[PDB]
Scaffold this active site. Structure first.
Site, PDB file in Angstrom:
ATOM      1  N   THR A 157     -69.658 -54.659 -32.124  1.00  0.00           N
ATOM      2  CA  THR A 157     -70.703 -53.602 -32.165  1.00  0.00           C
ATOM      3  C   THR A 157     -70.164 -52.318 -31.525  1.00  0.00           C
ATOM      4  OG1 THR A 157     -72.712 -54.933 -32.270  1.00  0.00           O
ATOM      5  CG2 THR A 157     -72.849 -52.879 -31.031  1.00  0.00           C
ATOM      6  N   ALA A 206     -78.106 -59.823 -31.301  1.00  0.00           N
ATOM      7  CA  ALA A 206     -78.922 -59.300 -32.389  1.00  0.00           C
ATOM      8  C   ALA A 206     -80.397 -59.645 -32.226  1.00  0.00           C
ATOM      9  CB  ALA A 206     -78.404 -59.804 -33.726  1.00  0.00           C
TER      10      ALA A 206
END
Ligand SMILES: *[B]([O])([O])[C]([C][C]([C])[C])[N]C(=O)C1=[C]N([C]2[C][C][C][C][C]2)N=N1
Ligand SMILES: *[B]([O])([O])[C]([C][C]([C])[C])[N]C(=O)C1=[C]N([C]2[C][C][C][C][C]2)N=N1
EC number: 3.4.25.1
Lengths: 231, 200, 235, 234, 214, 202, 232, 212, 239
Positions: free
Chosen positions: B1, B49
């Site tokens: 990420t 997530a």
């Protein structure tokens, strides 16, 4: 002396019957449902010139698509208004979609009869809420106006009037309202009816009107807007 | 990420990659790491997530309820403080999230970094994720407070591009947001493959 | 003012609330129980209040266990909850000691639960009386009866409800001990047709349940054929 | 004067005045008929309305695919009881993966409504229920009252002036078993129309129909969906 | 139950034309020791249902009493409704999963065999709450030894007869006695048809040891 | 520990050793493992001394109260069911191997086995303890149906003696008990009275 | 624990308990409030003006925060409980949000707690009224008034307690857009309002002003004596 | 004591402009043995929504039952069926409720949105989700994803005109990718269940696969 | 259950709380307690209502209690209620000293006990504490102080006060005899004796306690029999 959960000989809970009598002393709020949105209007009723009329919130926002007009004990309505706000916020968090107007009225009507002395908890109501509500919003079925009282019975109505002068106002809506009337036509009708049943000469700072249209959100008329329809 | 954010003269710029992984396997490449709390509030996501998604959605519901009661929009400092207190209850329980709250309240643009560990600091340029180290290099190098809007978009895009080139857990596209006084706007969503052909 | 609560004694030394709860049992229909040489036969005259009801509605005979029966009188809503209380006790006993609960113990356990509602102001005494019948190889044929005050006694032939003083004189002419169960059923349906008032009351369904050697110690409702023939013998 | 304030206070005649007053609440509601044949169970509820601009209150509610109820009395109380029945039907389908037998659901309602009439400070549920369902034993029509009592009937009617409807059902009950849905729904509509005053007559906006059968899940016809049944009555 | 004590081995199960047959050896093992050689591991739930549990025997006895009460409780109402083989299977699956979610499961693997409304039902529930239906089941070490035999007969002859399924169950029991080190040569055979649940035994297999001389 | 219970027509015969060891040391060399639960109901304890004593006291209390309410001699199966309940409930906290054996008017002389897990199974004879592993083959080859109250006492004494020699956790004296309808009769077998078996020697 | 319903409805839809709580507020000392432009004033009549009593331990004007302060009328014991609960909310609001509470936010909380006691079991309603006065972040002076029932309204000038009607009427005719023009002017309007409902006003009046960006300032007797001389 | 068990199974989901296909294998297993050869992992939620789960069968059986009950409760209070997007948003919160003892399930909801176009939602074990065009979850998710990317998403192709995904071409694609997953994955085999969600209801198709 | 209820914490038509007002009536029929604030200390002069020829002296005092190192108090009302109240006062002072490691200020202590008294008049359905207290102490913020407290939970600081039997008659006498700001402990004792006599004395019918400061230490002490006796004789010389 009797308990709060006592039935009368005619089959009515005394507490609820007295709570419905407390809504006849509150301000009047006329609601008219149309095809192009819902319109709510309440009588502010100021008792002093030193008293700021902007601090009187008879019409609140439950959500972007739902409004609310209350009558009777205003202080008791602050707990019902918060429940409705948390209910519509909870619905959005769980289903990622707006709650319907009838669903919000159902969740607020469930607390209506939730009171008692014996077999209760610390945070339990001791009596019923002496206030009536007029829910007006726009969902998948379009404009919808609902009415909820102290007993916990929520019904749908095309035009409703709650408050001290409800009887006189309800009759004036029965012969001036039709299914094809516009939202702008409804705002005038309500204002006209409100002016008749009021004691003080209606003006921009006396009443409070709110409207909820299909494509738009909940909206509260300002001074300017109010003045326009006043003349 | 890889998510970055920096506030220049014309507001705040927010950029992030779109790639989810399940170990070595690339789960998805179209994940939206930037969630909108409201019209003036943005929130980035990095780490878990499901952790970032559920807690930022919970913050968004809290900000909407807050605005109904106080009849006003929540500030960026209060929004971050709210989220910080939420994740503190489950401290040292496994929560993994590194968000960045950006918006334009009363005191101009505000950018706060809030992680699950407990941190909650304010700043002018942040970068969260596994590719944040690479993004910092390019960011600082080209960062200027008097950067033009077009120059700020370039910096944010170039910073995420280089970070996805060096980090294996960053890729996909580059979503860019621009927070202003009138509210945030979706600048663009260029794909990394198309950025590689333009920077070569 | 000494009859508003169950936790109050009157000057003479009586608990009026419990006496008022016994008045409800004297307003209900008559139910009788007869114990014999090898079983117990319950006969309840079900008074049908309407023609809209289905034949079998509002039963006053329940199986509290697989070897225990229960005929009730007085309030039905209260009696239904007492039947569920008796089922729990019978079920809890089998899961603790591993065998069917004795009728004497089940009666005592349920009578003690009924006596707990006659001491406080927070609750009110049950407004119903009921009989418990069972059959056990080791025990035999037992028949107990409990009222609203929580008193349980053993019997040979019992009767509760409105016509109980007139139904007890009909059960006194029977020699239950030497009698069997198939011969008692007839007599049980005969006494219920004698005590029932055809004037004051209207239509009435006759219920019949038994438990003894005949049904291998299992309490059940008397077979349709045997009930139909017994009803004809009464007429 | 001192025996009708608490439910835990037995009166000298052996009655509970509070339960009797709670049964008056069901008597003030609009009539609701409930009859059944051999493969269907119908509940025809007569909706009421205060103002002319107000809508008619719902009388028929969903409980499950095989169970439907008709209320009469306290609106709020009805909802409370409906939530319990809905939760009870959900639990049965979650644990045993099968519809809860109508009669077994009626015993759960009788036990939940009995508790309140024996405790101090509590009150009985001020609402009457007409349950229509269909299971392994065929179609059923149960009737529950405020005093925790339930009856298994072939036909039933509760509410204001339901004696006129009950009388009609008592003389036509024989010809209910061997009769199709169309005729059985019109047999109940005639009984519900009998409770109404001579002038005003059943319309398509003041009548609610709820049916459930062997090959049909509980359905609720309201406005335009009740014309079909309505058309065919003199 | 984190660690089982006295356990039972595999339980066989095969559906036939007009019922379900279930077999289980009568042995309670305490590790590698055959402690109790005469315990019934098959219980008749009601008229149309039967149960065969393997694994912890104490857990099976607890479930045997928790199920017996349920059946008794339902028969007291006498409303005509009765628990079907599929409803019992469902109830057991929820009971096994609930225990497993609370980190305290009932160490058992059940085989539910029933026959209601003209259908033969063969369920299977393990300790984790895993459940499914099949024409032939086998638990413990029977899934590696008996399952292959049962499946090889149902592939060329999907529908079996009462006598054929019973003859196949005896063949599987005999094979389990040759290869499972926790089995006994004494087993029970339960059959559920239209007439009800019937249990026979103890029965034995015809073991041959010709290979010992070669 | 080596407990054993066998049954005959009249009632049952119990037996146990008397050694209580804490490691390789005998803390109590004359322990009484046979515990009376009621008039005609006994129980042999094995496993943890503190766990078996706590459970026996609890069951004895529950059984005494139950027998006073029912006004009847308690059933041996009822006593075994009580034991089983606590043994199963707290199976992860207790370490017991109780053997309930008594005599009642209904079923006569019964022997129940309640092993560690908490299961309950009725047998004609049962053996428990750490020293019962060595006499498994002996009891299977010596037990015969039809044994009288005298042969049962010799059968139990013989099996316990054989287990005491091979097990280090078993030894001391032998405490027997013969329960019939007449009552309970305790008897201890010391040194010279303990059955002896010539040790194989070259 | 006690779970009895104290406040219940009556035949005419009235809530007697709340009406008796408002009756206790009428027997309290008069508390006047006047909102100015850059200064909010608070005036409190001192009935029991004993000479042997430390006056600093018995004041009707308190400070909830650094920008909010209040006065009351009714049962003093109850006012203390309500005043300390509001003080904890001001500190709680500062911990959750960087900025300080707004006058309305704290007034809403004080009024919500009062309504809570008029509808719960085992408790009785508060017998006090409050005049919350303060300044917001924008510098806009604020004045609200909460009562036993739980309802609050914004005001320009208000009075509570015994003879509150007489003072309210005097403010309606005297409060214009010139009377609150200057700092002293606004302070002189509050002292004049208390002179019509007091005995020999000047040594029985205790007032505290609150200017913008400044803490509560209680004007002592000497300063109050100087203002009475200008109103002669 | 392990409260989880890998039972295998793969579930596919492709969204069209008028349809939505959800397929899965019907083999339940454990370790090296086969539990049952007939255990589809597709469940019909509403009339335009089908859910597919893979992984620990115990959690699949419980999650599915919870979803069925949640749909019934939602229809009771809102007086209308739950939409595909609302069923996806609700599933996220249910999966995240057991965040510290999560369901070992891989869910793939496939149905139709308000407009009427196919909708596919992929979920992660803890609750995370997103809407895509195609999705593969299970033991052969890594074997099928790349093929769908190339064939349906037209990735890594320079000379393709990108023809619209028709319902007949997608039906062959699901059958083709599952025939390749049964050749490599040992948890995929025996039978393939195919549910086609259109405006005329939900259709079901069954095709055989390898048994070895 | 609801019929036997007496409803103690309930408002009345006039807006008053009956229970609290009835508890105030019981404090007017109790031993007179008076407190006077000086410049070098503060004293408590309470009258003993427990007089007899068969009573023992046993304790150190009868009405005056020690709350902590620098605080003391004199009750007036139900004797058993004070035993509960004064034991709670000691707990509050110990809890405060355990938290900040410093003596609790006098006004903070009085306020904490008043919050408990007011809670019994608003909820719980129990009768209020029928006792009035007088506190004397010394803290670093305000030095010597004297507080009064009643059953309603109301309190206030004073210079000179009196609670009990003749509060109104004693209060008036103190009003016209208290030279505010110029009072010493020695001259205050005379005031107490002078007022105590005119509101009822022997040296066994009264009990006095003074609280002064010596070398950065609070000293609380009850005057002895002889110590008081002399005071009583000196007031007779002026009469
Ligand atoms: B990022 O790489 O941090 C990204 C941010 C999210 C999408 C907002 N996170 C992930 O890619 C990611 C990976 N996982 C789990 C890893 C362990 C196996 C299950 C998935 N969760 N989020
Ligand atoms: B036997 O060996 O199993 C025997 C059975 C008991 C006496 C019922 N057990 C023991 O020998 C034994 C010893 N202990 C304790 C160990 C720690 C010190 C005190 C004794 N527990 N069981």
């Amino acid at each position: 002396d009797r308990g709060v959960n006592t039935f009368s000989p005619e089959g009515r809970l005394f507490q609820v019957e007295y709570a419905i009598e407390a809504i006849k002393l509150g301000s009047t709020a006329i609601g008219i449902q149309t095809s192009e949105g819902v319109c709510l209007a309440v009588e502010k009723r100021i008792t002093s010139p030193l008293m700021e009329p902007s601090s009187i919130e008879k019409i609140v926002e439950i959500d972007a698509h739902i409004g609310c007009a209350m009558s009777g004990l205003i202080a008791d309505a602050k707990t019902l208004i918060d429940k409705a706000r948390v209910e519509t916020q909870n619905h959005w968090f769980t289903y990622n979609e707006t709650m319907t107007v009838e669903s919000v009225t159902q969740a607020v009507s469930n607390l209506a009869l939730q009171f008692g002395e014996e077999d209760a908890d610390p945070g339990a109501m001791s009596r019923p809420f002496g206030v009536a509500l007029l829910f007006g919003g726009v969902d998948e079925k379009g404009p919808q106006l609902f009415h909820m009282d102290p007993s916990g019975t929520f019904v749908q109505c095309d035009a409703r009037a709650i408050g001290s002068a409800s009887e006189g106002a309800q009759s004036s809506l029965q012969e001036v309202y039709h299914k094809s009337m516009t939202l702008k036509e409804a705002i005038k009708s309500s204002l006209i009816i409100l002016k008749q049943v009021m004691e003080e000469k209606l003006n921009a700072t006396n009443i409070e009107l709110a409207t909820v249209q299909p494509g738009q959100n909940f909206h509260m008329f300002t001074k300017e807007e109010l003045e326009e329809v006043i003349k | 990420t890889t998510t970055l954010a920096f506030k220049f003269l014309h507001g705040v710029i927010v950029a992030a990659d779109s790639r989810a992984t399940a170990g070595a396997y690339i789960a998805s490449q179209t994940v939206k790491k930037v969630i909108e709390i409201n019209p003036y509030l943005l929130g980035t996501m990095a780490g878990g997530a499901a952790d970032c998604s559920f807690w930022e959605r919970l913050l968004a519901r809290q900000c909407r309820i807050y605005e109904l009661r106080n009849k006003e929009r929540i500030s960026v400092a209060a929004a971050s403080k709210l989220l910080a207190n939420m994740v503190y209850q489950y401290k040292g329980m496994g929560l993994s999230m590194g968000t960045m709250i950006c918006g334009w309240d009363k005191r101009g643009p505000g950018l706060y970094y809030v992680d699950s560990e407990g941190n909650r600091i304010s700043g002018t340029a942040f970068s969260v994720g596994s590719g944040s180290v690479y993004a910092y290099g390019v960011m600082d190098r080209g960062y200027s407070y008097d950067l033009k809007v077009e120059e700020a978009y370039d910096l944010a895009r170039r910073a995420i591009y280089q970070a996805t080139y060096r980090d294996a857990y960053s890729g996909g596209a580059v979503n860019l947001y621009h927070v202003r006084e009138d509210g945030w706007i979706r600048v663009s969503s260029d794909n990394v493959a198309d950025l590689h052909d333009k920077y070569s | 003012g000494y009859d508003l609560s169950a936790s109050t004694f009157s000057p003479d030394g009586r608990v009026f609330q419990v006496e008022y709860a016994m008045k409800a049992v004297e307003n209900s229909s008559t139910a009788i129980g007869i114990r014999c040489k090898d079983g117990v036969v319950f006969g309840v005259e079900k008074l049908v209040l309407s023609k809209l009801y289905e034949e079998g509605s509002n039963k006053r005979l329940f199986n509290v266990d697989r070897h225990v029966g229960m005929a009730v009188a007085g309030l039905l809503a209260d009696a239904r909850s007492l039947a569920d209380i008796a089922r729990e006790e019978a079920s809890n006993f089998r899961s603790n000691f591993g065998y069917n609960i004795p009728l004497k113990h089940l009666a005592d356990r349920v009578a003690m639960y009924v006596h707990a509602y006659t001491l406080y102001s927070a609750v009110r005494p049950f407004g119903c009386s009921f009989m418990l019948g069972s059959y056990s190889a080791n025990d035999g044929a037992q028949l107990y009866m409990i009222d609203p005050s929580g008193v349980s006694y053993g019997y040979w032939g019992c009767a509760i409800g409105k016509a109980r003083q007139a139904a007890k004189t009909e059960i006194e002419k029977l020699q239950m001990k030497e009698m069997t169960c198939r011969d008692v059923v007839k007599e049980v349906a005969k006494i219920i047709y004698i005590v029932h008032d055809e004037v004051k009351d209207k239509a009435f369904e006759l219920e019949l349940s038994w438990v003894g050697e005949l049904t291998k110690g299992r309490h059940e409702i008397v077979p349709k054929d045997i009930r139909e023939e017994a009803e004809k013998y009464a007429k | 004067n001192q025996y009708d304030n608490d439910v835990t206070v037995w009166s000298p005649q052996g009655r509970i005045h509070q339960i009797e007053y709670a049964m008056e609440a069901v008597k003030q509601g609009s009539a609701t008929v409930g009859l059944k044949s051999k493969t269907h169970a119908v509940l025809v509820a007569l909706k009421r309305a205060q103002s002319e601009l107000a809508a008619h209150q719902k009388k028929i509610l969903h409980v499950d695919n095989h169970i439907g109820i008709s209320i009469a009395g306290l609106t709020a109380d009805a909802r409370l009881l409906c939530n319990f029945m809905r939760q009870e039907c959900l639990d049965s389908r979650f644990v045993f993966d099968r519809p809860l037998p109508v009669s077994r659901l009626v015993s759960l309602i009788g036990s939940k409504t009995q508790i309140p009439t024996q405790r101090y400070g509590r009150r009985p549920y001020g609402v009457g229920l007409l349950i229509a369902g269909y299971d392994d034993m065929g179609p059923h029509i149960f009737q529950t009252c405020p005093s925790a009592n339930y009856f298994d009937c072939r036909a039933m009617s509760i509410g204001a002036r339901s004696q006129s409807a009950r009388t009609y059902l008592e003389r036509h009950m024989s010809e209910f078993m061997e009769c199709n849905l169309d005729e059985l729904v019109k047999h109940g509509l005639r009984a519900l129309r009998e409770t109404l005053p001579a002038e005003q007559d059943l319309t398509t906006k003041n009548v609610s129909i709820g049916i459930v059968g062997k090959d049909l899940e509980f359905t609720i016809y309201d406005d335009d969906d009740v014309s079909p049944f309505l058309d065919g009555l003199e | 139950t984190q660690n089982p004590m006295v356990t039972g081995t595999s339980v066989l199960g095969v559906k036939f034309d007009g019922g379900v047959v279930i077999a289980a050896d009568m042995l309670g093992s305490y590790g590698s020791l055959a402690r109790f050689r005469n315990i019934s591991r098959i219980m008749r739930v009601n008229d149309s249902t039967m149960l065969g549990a393997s694994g912890d025997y104490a857990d099976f006895q607890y479930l045997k009493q928790v199920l017996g009460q349920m059946v008794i409780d339902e028969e007291l109402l006498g409303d005509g409704h009765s628990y079907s083989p599929r409803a019992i299977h469902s109830w057991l699956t929820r009971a096994m999963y609930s225990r497993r979610s609370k980190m305290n499961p009932l160490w058992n693997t059940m085989v539910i065999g029933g026959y209601a409304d003209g259908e033969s039902f063969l369920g299977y529930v393990d300790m984790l709450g895993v459940a499914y239906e099949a024409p032939s089941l086998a638990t413990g070490y029977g899934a590696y030894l008996a399952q292959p035999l049962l499946r090889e007969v149902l592939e060329k002859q999907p529908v079996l007869s009462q006598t054929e399924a019973r003859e196949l169950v005896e063949r599987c029991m005999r094979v389990l006695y040759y290869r499972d080190a926790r089995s006994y040569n004494r087993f029970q055979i339960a059959t559920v048809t239209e007439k009800g649940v019937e249990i026979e035994g103890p029965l034995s297999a015809q073991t041959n040891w010709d290979i010992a001389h070669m | 520990t080596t407990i054993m219970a066998v049954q005959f027509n009249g009632g049952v015969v119990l037996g146990a050793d008397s050694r209580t060891t804490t490691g390789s040391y005998i803390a109590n060399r004359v322990t009484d493992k046979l515990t009376p639960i009621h008039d005609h109901i006994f129980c042999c304890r094995s496993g943890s001394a503190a766990d078996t004593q706590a459970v026996a006291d609890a069951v004895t209390y529950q059984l005494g109260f139950h027998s006073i309410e029912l006004n009847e001699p308690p059933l041996v199966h009822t006593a075994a069911s009580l034991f089983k309940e606590m043994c199963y409930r707290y199976r992860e906290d207790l370490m017991a191997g109780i053997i309930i054996a008594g005599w009642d008017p209904q079923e006569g002389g019964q022997v129940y086995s309640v092993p560690m897990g908490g299961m309950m199974v009725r047998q004609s004879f049962a053996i428990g303890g750490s020293g019962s592993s060595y006499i498994y083959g002996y009891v299977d080859a010596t037990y015969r149906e039809g044994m009288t109250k005298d042969e049962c006492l010799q059968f139990t004494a013989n099996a316990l003696a054989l287990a005491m020699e091979r097990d280090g956790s078993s030894g001391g004296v032998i405490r027997l008990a013969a329960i019939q309808e007449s009552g309970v009769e305790r008897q201890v077998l010391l040194g010279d009275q303990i059955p002896k078996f010539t040790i194989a020697t070259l | 624990s006690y779970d009895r319903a104290i406040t219940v409805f009556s035949p005419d839809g009235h809530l007697f308990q709340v009406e008796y709580a408002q009756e206790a507020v009428k027997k309290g000392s008069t508390a006047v409030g006047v909102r100015g432009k850059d200064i909010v004033v608070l005036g409190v009549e001192k009935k029991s003006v004993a000479k042997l009593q430390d006056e600093r331990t018995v004041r009707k004007i308190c400070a909830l925060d650094d920008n909010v302060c209040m006065a009351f009328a009714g049962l003093t014991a109850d006012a203390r409980i309500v005043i300390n609960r509001a003080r904890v909310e001001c500190q709680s609001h500062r911990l959750t949000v960087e900025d300080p509470v707004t006058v309305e936010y704290i007034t809403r909380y004080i009024a919500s707690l009062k309504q809570r006691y008029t509808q719960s079991n085992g408790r009785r309603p508060f017998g006090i009224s409050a005049l919350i006065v303060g300044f917001d972040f924008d510098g806009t002076p604020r004045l609200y008034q909460t009562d036993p029932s739980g309802t609050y309204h914004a005001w320009k000038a208000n009075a509570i307690g015994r003879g509150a009607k007489s003072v309210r009427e005097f403010l309606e005719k005297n409060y214009t857009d010139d009377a609150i023009e200057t700092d002293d002017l606004t302070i002189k309007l509050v002292i004049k309002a208390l002179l019509e409902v007091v005995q020999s006003g000047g040594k029985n009046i205790e007032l505290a002003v609150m200017r913008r960006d400044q803490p509560l300032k209680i004007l002592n007797p000497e300063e109050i004596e100087k203002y009475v001389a200008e109103i002669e | 004591f392990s409260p989880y068990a890998f039972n295998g199974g793969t579930v596919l989901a492709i969204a069209g402009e008028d349809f939505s296909i959800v397929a899965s294998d019907t083999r339940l297993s454990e370790g090296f043995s086969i539990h049952t050869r007939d255990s589809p992992k597709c469940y019909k939620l509403t009339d335009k929504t089908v859910i597919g789960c893979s992984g620990f069968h115990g959690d699949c059986l419980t999650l599915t039952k919870i979803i069925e009950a949640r749909l019934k409760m939602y229809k009771h209070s809102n007086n209308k069926a739950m939409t595909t997007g609302a069923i996806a948003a609700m599933l996220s919160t249910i999966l995240y409720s057991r965040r510290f003892f999560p369901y070992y399930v891989y869910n793939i909801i496939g149905g139709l949105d308000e407009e009427g176009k196919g909708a596919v939602y992929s979920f992660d074990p803890v609750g995370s989700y997103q809407r895509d065009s195609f999705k593969a979850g299970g033991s052969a998710s890594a074997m099928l994803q790349p093929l769908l990317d190339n064939q349906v998403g037209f990735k890594n192709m320079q000379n393709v005109e990108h023809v619209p995904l028709t319902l007949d071409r997608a039906m062959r694609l699901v059958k083709d990718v599952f025939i390749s997953a049964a050749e490599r994955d040992v948890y995929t085999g025996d039978a393939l269940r195919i549910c086609i969600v259109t405006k005329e209801g939900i259709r079901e198709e069954t095709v055989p696969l390898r048994k070895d | 259950s609801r019929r036997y209820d007496s409803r103690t914490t309930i408002f009345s038509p006039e807006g008053r709380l009956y229970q609290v007002e009835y508890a105030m009536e019981a404090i007017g029929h109790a031993g007179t307690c008076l407190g006077i604030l000086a410049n070098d200390g503060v004293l408590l002069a309470a009258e003993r209502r427990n007089i007899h020829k068969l009573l023992d002296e046993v304790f150190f005092s009868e009405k005056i209690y020690k709350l902590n190192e620098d605080m003391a108090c004199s009750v007036a009302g139900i004797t058993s209620d004070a035993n509960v109240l004064t034991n709670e006062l000691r707990l509050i002072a110990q809890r405060y000293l355990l938290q900040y490691q410093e003596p609790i200020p006098c006004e903070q202590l009085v306020t904490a006990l008043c919050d408990i008294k007011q809670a019994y008049t608003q909820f719980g359905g129990k009768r209020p504490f029928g006792v009035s207290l007088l506190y004397i102490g010394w803290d670093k913020h305000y030095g010597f102080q004297l507080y009064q407290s009643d059953p309603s939970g109301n309190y206030g600081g004073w210079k000179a006060t009196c609670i009990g039997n003749n509060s109104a008659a004693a209060v008036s006498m103190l009003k016209q005899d208290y030279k505010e700001g110029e009072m010493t402990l020695k001259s205050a004792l005379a005031l107490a004796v002078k007022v105590l006599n005119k509101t009822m004395l022997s040296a066994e019918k009264v009990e006095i306690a003074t609280l002064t400061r010596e070398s950065g230490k609070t000293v609380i002490r009850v005057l002895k029999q002889k110590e008081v006796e002399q005071l009583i004789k000196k007031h007779e010389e002026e009469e």
